[PDB]
Subunit: 354 residues, 4 copies
């Protein structure tokens, strides 16, 4: 970062971090229309999805109903781990016996996490996600490496989360089959406020990709996505898939009863590091609610439609070509101009609410 | 773009995009006053307007009443294409038989669009606008080139929309008589959110102009304009005309009945890519309403008055000289200072509402 | 401006404009306390004020009561010109016969303005202000030069307004005794929106000063000031005095009756380019109201107290040394941190309202 | 500062100032977990705290109850000086006789301040804080140097406040045992608005540290902190401790009765430069209220928990290693993404309110 901002060390403030709202994809020469785009992409080294989307491993987003629906829509669910091992394993079996659908499951770090992992593999899980706030901790890299050693022939092992090139490189050397990027950008996340730590999500992807791409390891962009265009941006920055919590938490298939506050409909959505999920603790998430959004299938159709539009605009027949697209950086005025502006919206759009 | 923002490719984030609110025109030495300014400008290679303004080809902005009024005010209307071919053609005839006024009409891409185009030419249209979200698609360049080949002796052919230098260059090589710039900046547009694609409108004009100006092809700045000063900025960036939807949709001549909500008056205004206009679809516009603004003539007087003021300030006797003016880039504080600030407005101004 | 923002001309977007909220003064080594600071400064080549403040030539800010009070407080008023010549001249006499106080008066450009000017000189005015939106117009430079030729032995002649180095240089060569800077930053001004023209006020001062300082011509910073700290910033950027409209319009001495809306007290304040002041016109100002602020003397005490504080902080015993102080440029976060933040204000401060 | 912003002097606008919301800490390789972090740090050359936090010397933040509680929590209180000397001294004795707890006390500059200081030393104070708005004034450096000469064997002497490298260097040469950084960032402070003076707090720390670190003098980051992550940022920028007013003013131990406005609970909090504290004056602070936050111990637990999280993320076993961490600079979009976003919070978190 060139500009003088204090002190005598030019590396103290090491770069300028961008996130989704900071950039637009540039249109390019195209012989692609949304209809002819191919949205398939690698979830891991061995697993390719038809639709490059996976649901967050959260107790207000993914249990078996969500996992089943995501798989049928061409993506995948990652089953959360805030429940007894026998119950998480049973949910893996529920998905597996609905057509041999793909499914993943989260585990932590340690002895209990290891027992959880072995049970999940026994239940037939396809992907284990080592699900942590900071994968550059040595204990996490150990967990990833040992799982890959012991069961890596039977199962794919994802490691996360990271926000730097060096952390992505450490997970690759540990043997990760994919690397999940996102420290702090989650809609329900307070890590960046409470700890003061993280990196803006576009820059975090660009950096992780610089480590993972040359090693042939897919990057999963996790957190901070709010519009279908954000998915296109994350993939163009080099991710192969995107993980969604907020965008899916409001759907019929997410766990939770409908909340009916003041004429409107909502579903609860909460961080896994919130007090409520963990039950003095120092939480790194909040508890809240999102608008009810109806069937998962209709949300995914809108998201994939927006991604297909982006592929047509950028002349990308495949996700692999989308990953080569270019950005322009924009100002606050640019962002206001990008949204609808100076008009009163009178009708809801299925892919846009202010 | 010099500053490090992630990864190892300096061309990934290729430049900084500016739009109207990011810049001001610098005053210069002047022997021009608003009264003596000459606002005429090229719409196309062959067509010069007295006032460098054209109304959007939208079903809530331009049918024959709007086209007639815009022509009489010294500009032009582009008749929308969300209606049967015989009806669009009939409206062209309505305008033509009100004094031989100039008129344009939108067409799409394909066989039905081609039949539409031939009928419009037969009705006496002066300008065909190949009206698309992404003119850098090969199908659009083909449509432009074939129209120019078949009927280009009888009619001027405009192509759009683009947001890059390379896309403008492709339209010029395809034979466009003008190039329309604007991917996503429209007030009712969600393309930049839904697809994540576009470029801020001042930068988009500067880039398109770098391709079109040396080839002698006029650029039409389309979308994102909200104040008379925006028109001056778009022209100074090198456009020859500006296309307006939002600013004209509220006028008496725009299609639509007056809406009377809660003591106030409005007219409907909607994207042509909204669900409502297209009638599961994945829309790229919204449906809404804008304040009623009275007769078109009075709006155009205010817009041209603001443009004339800019010409006096920049010492520009003609639009061609305005296109040589300089900008200063501004911060959010600069923008707040540019608007009225720290005062409660007690009376409406005819050319300013907060 | 180094960063790529579109096109092939590096001078198209010629620099980055800053205004007051973009910068802070850096504290420095000091043997000055607010009590020992000397706030005197040149209004013009020949006229030094005890307090570097002058009231705007506006019909809601300065008639004779305001002019008298400003002079007694150690500054000066400039009498507005939206009234018959005999009446403006009479007000000059009212001030002159209240102790031989300093007074200025605005005039325009042309034959009627020239008659106005001669009458004002006859009435004993000390300063003529050629009061225009764009002093880089040739007609204005002619007016300034001819006044200085004809009556420049009897009276000081101020010219404005400008926002560029070249325009300030032209006024200096025309013979101006001071140069007034400010195109568009006024609180009631819409020029930057309606015409799209101007330059952020700190940059406008820095540029004008680069022309005026080496010629020994004082710069008057006109418009955009809202806090006592803004006065210190304008002077540190190199201005010698500041002109205030909004900050003084609410005082007892400003023309206007008190407005009592919904339990509170206000006074009308309006641009001289508003429809109301000019009485289809294309206005460049709005009509509004500001909070009532009580006696002028108490406002000026607060403003000078804040300026004296700045002088103590920067180690400036005199305004001439304050003009050598340094800035740091700040971000939106910096600006939020500069104001009170994260607290509910329960008591009014005499020099701060949110 | 490279970019052209006006005039011909590249040093006029000398750098870009950042504050807390402008930066995030980058995660790094770590063998630290929050539990194993060591939060101890130097308050002064001779005094090490277990927890790197000290309460502001304000009459709505620190009297003896607060000083006692802060010391027991592993930090320190600085007793305010808006009260008679015998009473401030008595409060020092109250703290000293509650277990020989550490305590500091503020003094001003001059003869009365000197008498106050001698009485405080006699009462057994551990730290004298020369408590001023501008320590680069020569009178302040004299006060610091004379105290260190006369009583510097018995007591540690802190000097502040500063916002520049040169001012920190002057205090070091004057003999300060620590340097307090912060000109204007306080939540109740208006200095930056009223005087227009200051520097954004991250840059102010980086600059002061460049002077103090090589001389082995600890820096106290004072003002502007609102979240536990801010404490981690201030320390990573090189401060050794942080001083808090706003974050502690709402606690049970802060002076003040509970205010019960409209169903909610608050405590008064006011600048020491506000009219109310000083009792025409020209104040540099405001009077207000903050939410009631319960026992001090629980607030400090949340703050230290967030700091420990940051240490785990950055791989810092000690504060000395945290001081070597790196930042990424972020945009407004980055800041929105850092907070919770696009969710309605339904439950209060103990370490986060919007
Ligand atoms: C046409 O109205 C606009 C305009 C003018 C703009 C936008 C927009 O979203 C819309 C709404 C979009 C539609 C109403 C849908 N539509 C219809 C057409 C007519 O031309 C269709 C042809 O345009 C090309 N095309 C149109 N969209 C794409 C895409 N997403 N990817 C690749 N090619 C695309 C393709 O060759 C196709 O055959 N273009 N967009 C916009 O973002 O900036 C300008
Ligand atoms: C005079 O009040 C201001 C002032 C001081 C400012 C502004 C403004 O809009 C106004 C309101 C504008 C008016 C009340 C209209 N007006 C009257 C005059 C008196 O001088 C008129 C002469 O000023 C020159 N002039 C004034 N405006 C222009 C222009 N737009 N283009 C070219 N020349 C212009 C021209 O030579 C003309 O003969 N200037 N503006 C402003 O934006 O920054 C400063
Ligand atoms: C003391 O509280 C603060 C503190 C800590 C800060 C600020 C502040 O406005 C205030 C409020 C200001 C006052 C309560 C007034 N005050 C009293 C003192 C005690 O020391 C007084 C001495 O401090 C020096 N000093 C204090 N202010 C100035 C100034 N504006 N210009 C030059 N010198 C100044 C000068 O030598 C003077 O003898 N400093 N400010 C601030 O902006 O950042 C830190
Ligand atoms: C797990 O959920 C997340 C995720 C995915 C993210 C975040 C987050 O705050 C949370 C909430 C945090 C928790 C629910 C707490 N938790 C539990 C785990 C499971 O793995 C624990 C292991 O992860 C490592 N670890 C986890 N947090 C830290 C830290 N602050 N410092 C050092 N190491 C840390 C450490 O080795 C530890 O043994 N990670 N965070 C986040 O900010 O970005 C991604
Ligand atoms: O409590 C937490 N604190 C921080 N991040 C969390 C927490 N719980 C889940 N996450 C992350 O936030 C992501 C969802 O982000 P969203 O799509 O923006 O709502 C998840 O996939 C996790 O990576
Ligand atoms: O639904 C749509 N989505 C995106 N852009 C549209 C749509 N309909 C019209 N437009 C564009 O928006 C322009 C009007 O923008 P406005 O002047 O900012 O309201 C039109 O001239 C078209 O280029
Ligand atoms: O109607 C107008 N349009 C633009 N600027 C104006 C108008 N009337 C007065 N001004 C300028 O605005 C200044 C006052 O700005 P303020 O102190 O920010 O309210 C005056 O001294 C004039 O330079
Ligand atoms: O009235 C004042 N004006 C300016 N700063 C003050 C005033 N009173 C206290 N301060 C500073 O503000 C700090 C507290 O800031 P806070 O933690 O952001 O609320 C104190 O420790 C002092 O350095
Ligand atoms: K838009
Ligand atoms: K303004
Ligand atoms: K402040
Ligand atoms: K967040």
């Amino acid at each position: 970062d060139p500009v003088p901002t204090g002190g005598d060390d030019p590396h103290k403030v090491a770069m300028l971090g961008l996130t989704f709202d900071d950039v637009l994809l540039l249109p390019a020469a195209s012989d692609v229309v949304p209809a002819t785009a191919d949205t398939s992409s690698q979830l891991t080294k061995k697993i390719r999805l038809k639709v490059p989307l996976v649901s967050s491993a959260m107790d207000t987003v993914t249990e078996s109903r969500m996992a089943i629906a995501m798989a049928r829509a061409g993506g995948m669910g990652v089953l959360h781990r805030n429940l007894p091992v026998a119950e998480q394993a049973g949910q893996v079996e529920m998905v597996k016996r609905s057509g041999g659908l793909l499914v993943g499951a989260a585990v932590g770090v340690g002895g209990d996490a290891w027992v959880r992992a072995m049970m999940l593999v026994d239940a037939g899980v396809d992907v284990l996600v080592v699900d942590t706030a900071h994968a550059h901790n040595r204990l996490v890299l150990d967990m990833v490496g040992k799982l890959k050693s012991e069961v890596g022939d039977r199962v794919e092992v994802v490691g996360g989360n990271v926000a730097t090139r060096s952390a992505a490189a450490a997970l690759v050397d540990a043997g990760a089959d994919a690397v999940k990027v996102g420290v702090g950008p989650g809609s329900i996340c307070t890590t960046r406020v409470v700890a003061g730590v993280g990196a803006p999500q576009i820059t975090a992807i660009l950096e992780a990709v610089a480590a993972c791409r040359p090693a042939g390891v897919p990057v999963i962009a996790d957190g901070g996505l709010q519009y279908s265009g954000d998915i296109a941006k994350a993939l163009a920055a080099g991710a192969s898939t995107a993980m969604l919590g907020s965008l899916l938490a409001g759907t019929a298939e997410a766990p939770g009863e409908l909340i009916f506050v003041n004429g409107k409909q909502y579903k609860s959505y909460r961080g896994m590091g919130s007090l409520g999920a963990m039950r003095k603790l120092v939480p790194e998430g909040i508890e809240g609610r999102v608008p009810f959004r109806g069937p998962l299938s209709s949300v995914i159709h809108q998201l994939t439609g927006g991604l297909r539009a982006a592929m047509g605009y950028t002349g990308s027949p495949t996700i692999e070509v989308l990953q080569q697209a270019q950005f322009v950086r924009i100002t606050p005025a640019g962002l206001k101009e990008s949204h609808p502006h100076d008009v009163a919206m009178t009708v809801e759009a299925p892919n846009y609410y202010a």
